[PDB]
Amino acid sequence: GVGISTGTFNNQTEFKFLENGWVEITANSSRLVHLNMPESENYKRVVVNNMDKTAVKGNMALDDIHVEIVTPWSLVDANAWGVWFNPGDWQLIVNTMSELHLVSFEQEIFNVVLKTVSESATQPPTKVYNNDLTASLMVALDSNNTMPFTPAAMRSETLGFYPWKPTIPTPWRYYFQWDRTLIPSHTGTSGTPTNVYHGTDPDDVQFYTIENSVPVHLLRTGDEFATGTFFFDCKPCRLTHTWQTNRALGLPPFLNSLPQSEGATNFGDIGVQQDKRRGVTQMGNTDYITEATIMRPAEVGYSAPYYSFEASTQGPFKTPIAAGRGGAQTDENQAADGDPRYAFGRQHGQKTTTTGETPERFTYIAHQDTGRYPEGDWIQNINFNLPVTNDNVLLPTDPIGGKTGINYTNIFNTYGPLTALNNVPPVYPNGQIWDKEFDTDLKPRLHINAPFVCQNNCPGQLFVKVAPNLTNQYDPDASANMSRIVTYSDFWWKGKLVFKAKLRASHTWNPIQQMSINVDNQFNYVPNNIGAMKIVYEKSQLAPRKLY
Amino acid sequence: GVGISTGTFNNQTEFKFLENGWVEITANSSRLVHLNMPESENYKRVVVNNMDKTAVKGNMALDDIHVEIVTPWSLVDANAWGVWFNPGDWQLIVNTMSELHLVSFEQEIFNVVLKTVSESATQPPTKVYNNDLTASLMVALDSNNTMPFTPAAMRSETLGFYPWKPTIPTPWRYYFQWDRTLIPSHTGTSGTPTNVYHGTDPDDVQFYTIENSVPVHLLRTGDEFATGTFFFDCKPCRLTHTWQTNRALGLPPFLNSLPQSEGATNFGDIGVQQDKRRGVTQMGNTDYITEATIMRPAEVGYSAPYYSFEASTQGPFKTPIAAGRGGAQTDENQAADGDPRYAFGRQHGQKTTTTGETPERFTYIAHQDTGRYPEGDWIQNINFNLPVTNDNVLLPTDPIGGKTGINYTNIFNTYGPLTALNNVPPVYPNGQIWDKEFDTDLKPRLHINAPFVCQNNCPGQLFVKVAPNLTNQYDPDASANMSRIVTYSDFWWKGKLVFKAKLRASHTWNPIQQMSINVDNQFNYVPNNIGAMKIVYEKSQLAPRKLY
Amino acid sequence: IGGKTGINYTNIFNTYGPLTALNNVPPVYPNGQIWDKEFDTDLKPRLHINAPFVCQNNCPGQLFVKVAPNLTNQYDPDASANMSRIVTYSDFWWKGKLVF
Amino acid sequence: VGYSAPYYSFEASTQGPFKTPIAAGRGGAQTDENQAADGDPRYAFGRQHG
Amino acid sequence: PAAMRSETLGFYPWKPTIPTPWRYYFQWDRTLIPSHTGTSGTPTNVYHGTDPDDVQFYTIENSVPVHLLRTGDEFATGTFFFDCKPCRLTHTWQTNRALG
Amino acid sequence: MDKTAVKGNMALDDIHVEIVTPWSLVDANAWGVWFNPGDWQLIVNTMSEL
Amino acid sequence: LPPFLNSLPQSEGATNFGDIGVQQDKRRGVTQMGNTDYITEATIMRPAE
């Protein structure tokens, strides 16, 4: 079966308009994947330890020590928006749809090829490449998710984003249990804190092998491998944002006095003394009904401690947060808090011809308003008694623990039974699409890395590896290290991801926000005179939705 | 039937998604119409003559003399985009659809009311208003289009554009035949040109009466009038523009030399001597194949004489043109040529609280590129022979007729059997929707005022009038002028216009142009502190389409 | 005209009108094109100057060909370089059938 | 039968000048070749096409 | 269409041929004011760039399904049936002067 | 522009922009690809329309 | 997915560690600290907590 193709290249997105404003989006994606034989045909338990860094007082957050099992397999990950949609498809979906549903997923591997490299080491000297017609490509599909879930989008290692650029898979590796202790300190700390890696707890040791837990297929040139169709189990993802705050929920106060002339300084007037008003409040001990005092249904968003690192049995880790935000976009300098930052390279959006090893990055700033402005928070004594007196207020300016740069807001947490919150928004093109749910008895209410989380069923990971091409001399009983003919493989990948979307409706008199090409961004969507390209990030929930 | 309503108020737009990316758009529009009794219950033949103006040499274009028949009826016109869609509906249609089809139209008149005004002329003195329960509102629907077609959008006189603002109909009047002669002149002209109104040609006289040619209904409070549904006869209207010029049609030249470094001055190079190239040309006498010389299929757009006034039996009139345009938008100062200019008032888009009698206006600048840049035109002798010599070129700089401000381009016309052209684009909210076809044997290939032209069938005009409320003293045999109780009427109007649209597809890698609200235009879509409003114009064909 | 010694009114002249009778373009052997695609404008040309046949609605689709990338053992998607690939070329036979 | 159009007329739009197209050319007693010009197509080709 | 630049398949059944590199036009604004030999100063000759509202970047991968053919493979287009008027192979010689 | 910079050379304008793709086109839309001189003579001499 | 080690040990040994081999502020991945370029094992983004 050498001279016969086993598949088709398809990278088209189809919209199929059903009934009742629901369309079916079929995203096809094909790619040529390049794969070299493993640097080692063995599994390894490698420890990483950068104590030299953290040894410097004040650097706890630069902790990198961990342990991982390095396997001789590669992972073919296509779980990122950029792998399926191009800028033009995203604009259509994001501008005209109101919500998204993830439906199916299926892959395929065809037109496999295995070449060999011979050192034509003559003068120059040289190199020769030849087909190894009887060689094999090993393929394993972990349908039962026996293996550790390792989504590549987290480290910018998924398949590439351009239909016409060959891509590659990533070396697979997973974490191995270890104990580590790191006591925090600051520049003025004395003596040496405590920074040790304790080793492994035998009761938490799990060494996984693909050979032992997954059936492997050997594909020769004439072979093809096709995953069946996987049908997802999820909630819909919204493509519209909310802008309401507790301050904009409900019936506003009745203005007994309205302006009578156009004018920036012509305001309306409630026209009633603040302690002589009517309405409901939750401050049982005052007569002041204010817009900051009046009672609202519940609470949109919450407060959490910031740049808080917690520690458990294997080192410090940052305390997660859902969303960030602020008022008049002090943007960028605005950033920080809980706005995701993505760093990527030449294959996932960075300008293709860019030299150097510095990645490209961006901080995604969502349209939703469900965050907090710490500088505006404050706490005061129940007696109320305005104007508040210094000993009766704790402002986000007063120090804590004596530290000049720490407030109570840094320690603060206002999550409770009244917290209303939104799931995470899609991030094009670098964001991950779906995630696997934690196998704990009590699960997170949402995942900070993907808008879709398969509870029960999640697609299995696909592993690939070039089978060993040994030379006439091979001795299993020797330390050496098997020597094998330099072999590599190229195969085509093809996936199909199906969504179900709901067409949007116009509910207000005014137009709304839409994604569009303009004089300014115009050149982020076309190649240059050298064929250089780049894929700029874009927002998903542009279009307000009322919350209450 | 006095205390019982005869209709419902509905001003909602519905999109009903059928099969195969085709949606059905139902636009409902309701309004409260106010109507006074006619200033005269008689038809009048009035002549307008402003010779004082045109008597001033050089003012021919300010000619206003005409003759019209002034009728005692009013017209209820709803043929303008603003009567059916609000900014939010337009953005949805314009951003997500690719073409429009006009399907039905139907109207209705309900909840009629007729009041009377009594001069409570006591001290202040005063006024009293009372219901005249037995009074009638006369309604006539000209289904067979017997009457002259007089679309109100041409003079900004259609129903209003805000669902919550009472509107009014316009006094109906039509043109009457007359002969007029006006000889052109300029500031330095001597003697007096010739500016006379000759009167009427008896063989062209047509005096129309609604009473004699249309059946009239008399509606009392308890009555309602409902037009059946009219189904249009038309072609589809496109919501995408073309950008290609003759210069961008076909296979571009093969570049034998491509850039090798990113850089504004790094150009490609055909790399072949101009008179040593291959391809086809229509200049049978040269060997130069240039991008301006190479042969193209036909010709996109044409040239016509500009600010050309022609004259026939009733005075001068401007020579019409389809579209205008230019390169790097020298915009506005760009304008002129054939870009429509709309002047309107408080009821159709002008800021509602604006004082004074000066209207609001705009020049619609289309996205399509099918116009000409006269400054770049030139004509040269067949011998060719470059560089062209002065006596062998006529530049749009060389004078004509000796006039320092006139070129050949002003006289120029290049319309022919190879002219490719586009129909006119929709103009929101002031543009007219449909038009009636000329009853000539050879019709225009398009109308410059509306994207839809019903050839065979066009909806009939609806006329309204308050029936005469006479006093105890009425004498038909006397010159006087009938005296009648001051009566007026208020009734609700309700229309339903149905379209059929085709959802758009994304055909390119790059995103495209979309209408959107931004920091700059944000306040054109919301009322102010006094309730002032305005309706800003918007473009319809934003989204390129390839022509060839 | 315009004072120019080498320009007439005929150079500016246009007599196209409602009475113009005209013929379509003639076939040119062997260099002439056979058919052409119609312009997607609302008002089309009465004829095309480059081909005697113009498919209004339906026109054959274009056929594109390309030699798929034959990479060497060294390929790095994340690098500026420019992929290096084994020098490959192709020869295939084409066969068409046009019926009149 | 036939019509008159401006000759060696170049018009301009948003992307540069282009020659005004014409349907057919011609003349009486074939002053042929020197006759040419007007609207008679000229074809330039190579070794593979003639 | 390649015939416009003399780039179609060859004309001899017994001579190997080749296809032409595909390329298409992209939108751009350019201004060139005409002049003649005696013109003074410098006319105006500038390339303004691209209008974002007319930008269309086409990729075959994204809009057309691609087939991969190995030696043992073949590709066959179905039959396309044209939509056109007939083409005449006879000329007219009459002028207004020879009508009637 | 070096060319058109020379007053009187407007018609030698070549400036344009094009997207260069990595694909090739197989075009057979020309009379010579289908008929040889002998076939053309037969069609042209004995037929009246095509 | 743990970080990709650009440098692996070559001898058995308690002090023979692997090495990410990339400057901390020149790495790729996702973080929730919108205002820094440091992608660390204590900084990198995890699904939840």
Ligand SMILES: [Ca+2]
């Ligand atoms: Ca233990």
Ligand SMILES: [Ca+2]
């Ligand atoms: Ca906001």
Ligand SMILES: [Ca+2]
């Ligand atoms: Ca007469």
Ligand SMILES: [Ca+2]
């Ligand atoms: Ca343009």
Ligand SMILES: [Ca+2]
């Ligand atoms: Ca523009």
